[PDB]
């Protein structure tokens, strides 16, 4: 619903975005910092929640810089494109 932190916990460069059964699945690489399940994604139009992270086809609770991951987001965040860098917030 809203972002409470001043600075991002991490950033993700989007490699591919797919919508499947009404949900955005984002493939990308953590560019800086770290992201975890439950963190907030600042999209162009909305704020989403990280629901799941997979790395090397394995569920993980968090990922750090250099990790290439898939992410499921909760909430409509607007149009995300390959090449966008999404800011991710602890709260």
Automatic annotation (TrEMBL):
- Example GO BP: translation
Protein name from the UniProt record: Elongation factor Tu-type domain-containing protein
Q: Where is the Elongation factor Tu-type domain?
A: 7-87
Which spans are transmembrane here? none
Single GO MF descriptor: GTP binding
